[PDB]
Each structure stands twice: as structure tokens, then as C-alpha cells.
Amino acid sequence: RDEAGITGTWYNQLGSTFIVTAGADGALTGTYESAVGNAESRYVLTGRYDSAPATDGSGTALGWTVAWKNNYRNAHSATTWSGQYVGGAEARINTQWLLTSGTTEANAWASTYVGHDTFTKVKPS
Amino acid sequence: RDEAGITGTWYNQLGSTFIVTAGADGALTGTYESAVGNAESRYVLTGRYDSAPATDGSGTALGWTVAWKNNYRNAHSATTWSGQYVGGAEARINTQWLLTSGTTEANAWASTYVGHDTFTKVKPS
Amino acid sequence: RDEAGITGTWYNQLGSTFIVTAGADGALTGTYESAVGNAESRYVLTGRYDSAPATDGSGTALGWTVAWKNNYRNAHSATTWSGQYVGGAEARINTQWLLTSGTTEANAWASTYVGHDTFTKVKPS
Amino acid sequence: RDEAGITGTWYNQLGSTFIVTAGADGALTGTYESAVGNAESRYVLTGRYDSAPATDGSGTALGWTVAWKNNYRNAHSATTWSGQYVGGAEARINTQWLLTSGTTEANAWASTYVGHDTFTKVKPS
């Protein structure tokens, strides 16, 4: 089950850490933090996933957002990740992300970074 | 205030409709639907925003996700929007989006579309 | 004809100016400059277009690159535009772009901006 | 030197093959083909690179375009890659790409895919 396979802890290639609960009606809730795992680097995340009949080994589409504000930092920024969960002994969440910074109208052209990250169940290094 | 300016109804250039509540601790909750506004085309959205001291007329960074599953449709897909809110008599939310479809491993190269949309407070046409 | 409709001068929403020649074997060659049109702001561009039988009023896919180095500036950056030409009395080139800056390995996460621009045949303002 | 380090053959993670010449005045010219290396899968590429003083081990920004038309195929599409070259015994070109398909006005929302690819000097597998 998708809900089952998604819920838990995921690590990117730099061991940033994604702790998520997949709810029965499509909610993703959790925390995004960085490898050393201090509250200083922990942020709320919220998103959604689209569970659908398991055919052709298709991944499960999902997305989430982190606003980069906690009790220690206010980066005036938010990232969204869009991707898919694929289950199995080598389960992965493959994503592309957008990071937008709060900017002036004149600097808004330069407000949005794009990148990618791949999450697995095993902490690297 | 950001929380105040964001909460409400927003329309893209095609009159797709975004109904959001901005919570005090950074949550975005609401519905994303399309112009004719039938429940058939209404989906849950969830996201986050980063409120920060109003300086240099900087926008407020935010993001949200829609998983394209409701009681009428299951598109096996999710979109994330990343952008910024700018307030005023011509308030806007400027976004870039990523749409990921659930795909096979062989088709995963072609899983993610990118685009943009601008939301305003006034319904077009 | 595509080759015919593309060749010439195009303007974005800020009147940045794109002067292109579409070659018979798919080449795009020209200059990208900014509204005031000084050599100081003029850069070489090169790209490709895919001419294909005119069916269903489909656009013509194309792309180009500008490296942000001329005799006046070296921004250590390059932009690529990917989009499509659509002909007619309101001809347009609709694009999405990626801007990459030369960065350190530690800063490479933050190396690539994304945006969009729409070009028309008529100089705005 | 940048011009020297870039010119040659590069392979992505699937062994698609990028054969490029970096010119003295910033041109990239070459062929993009797929692992088996048949003319059927070989396409022209053209782009630009921004050589700049070697400081802080910064990469060299570059971009290129392939229109997906050759004597065997006309995919009505073009891809642009935006990224940076980093030299050394483990030289790499890290990219993000945009693929645009020629579409109708109604389907133009869904015209552009985004992804990433990393090129190295050594053919995988």
C-alpha cells in the first residue's frame, strides 16, 4: 500500500531528512530537517499524494512544501517538491523542486531556483 | 498583514479558482477548482507560507500542492506551485509550477511538466 | 512558412529584444539585447528549431542559448529558452527559461533559476 | 583551459552521447546521439559557453539546444540544457533541461517537460 510505503523517514543524497505521515485521504504531514537533525534546522512540511490502482509498476504522484521559517530562522523563502514514490526493497521518492525567495518587483525575474533530489530509506555515508 | 492579504479567493488567467485560508503558524489550506466551479473539478490543497517583516516591498514566499484525486477523478498526478504574494489594490500571487504524473521507470524522464500562472483577486472575462 | 515567420525581431514584455535568423537546416542565429539596444547589452545567441508539417495549428518547437559574455560584461552565466513559435497576425514565441550561474560545488544547489517570457513582433510601451 | 576541457565526448547516466567542440569565441557545436550511436539517433546541437577567470573552483556556465529532427525522425520537439562544466580527473557537466513539444493553444499548458542529467567523460555500464 502507498500510504504504508510513504509514511516514515527519507534521506536525500546529502542526508537531509524528510519525516512524513501519509494520511488516508491523501494528506502528507511532517518535518524536513538536515542531517545533524537539530531543531534549529527542522521545518514543517505539508503536501498531498495521489494513490491510484497499482498498474505497470507506475509511481505514486505527490508533492509538498516547506516554508523556511522556524523558531531559529526566517529565510523569506519556500520550496516545493513535485515527484513520485516508487516502492520496493530500493524504494525511492524522485523529485524536482522549486525554491522561491520573497523579492522586490524589479528582482522577481530572479526569485525562483530549480533543482532535483532523490530520497531513499537508507541514510547515506 | 500577510495572513490577511492571502486568505480568500484567487483566479488565474483562465479563471481557475484557488480558495485559501492562511493560518497564523504558516499553514495554507483550501480548495483548487476550475472556473465553472463544479465539485467535479474541486480538489484539496495544502501548503505553507513564510511571513517576514515588510521591507523593500518584498513579496511573501509560499507554495502549495494539489493531488489530482477527488470523488470524480483520479489523474494519477500532483501539481506544486511555488511563488510569492504581493499585496495592494492589484494584489497578485506569481507562481511557477511542476506537475508530476505517476509513470513507469522507463517513462520517468517524461514525468514532470513545468509552467507558470499568475493569480489575482478579480475573476477575468 | 516557419523559417519565414521566425526570422526577424522579437520583443519580450520588458522590450528586451531577440534578433534571429532561422536557417533552412534548422539553425537559429542572432543577437539578444536589451530595450535601449546598446552594444553594451548585446550578446550572441545560437539555437535550433524543429519545422514540421502544419497540422492542428500546432506551434514550432525551438530553443536557444545566450552566454552572458560580450566585450563589456562577463556574468559567468548562460540562459537557455525552450518554447514554441505560433504564427499569425498576433505571432508569438512562448518560452520557459533556465539561467545557470558558474558556482562552487557547495553552491551548485543554487546555480539554476527558472522563469518564462513571451515574445511578440510589436515593441511594447 | 575551459575550451580544452569541454571539447570532446560526454555521456549521461544512460550513455546518451554528447560530442561537442568549444570554439574560441564561446560557440558550442556538435552532435547528440544515443548509446548505440546509430545516425538514426544523431541530432545537431548548438549552444554557447561563458569562459571566465578560474576562481574558487567555480564551474563554467553553458547551454545548448537539440531540435529533435534528423533524416530519420521529426519529433516536433526541442530540448535545451542549461548547466555548468567542472573540470578535473572527474570532470562533469551538470545540467537541467527543458523539452518543449509543438502543441495546440489549448494543449500549450502541457507543452514543456523539465528534468536533469549529468554528463561525464567515461561511458557507463
From Swiss-Prot, chains A, B, C, D:
Short sequence motif Cell attachment site: positions = 48-50
Q: Which GO terms describe its molecular function?
A: biotin binding
**Keywords, A to Z?**
Biotin, Secreted, Signal
Chief localization: secreted
Domain (Avidin-like): give its ranges: 3-124
Where is biotin annotated to bind?
Y32, Y43, W81, W97, W109
Compartment list: Secreted
Q: Name one GO cellular component term.
A: extracellular region
Note the subunit structure.
Answer: Homotetramer.
Its biological function? The biological function of streptavidin is not known. Forms a strong non-covalent specific complex with biotin (one molecule of biotin per subunit of streptavidin).
Q: Which protein family is it in?
A: Belongs to the avidin/streptavidin family.
Q: What is this protein's name? A: Streptavidin
The record lists the organism as Streptomyces avidinii
Which residues of the entire protein appear here: the answer is 38 to 160 of 183
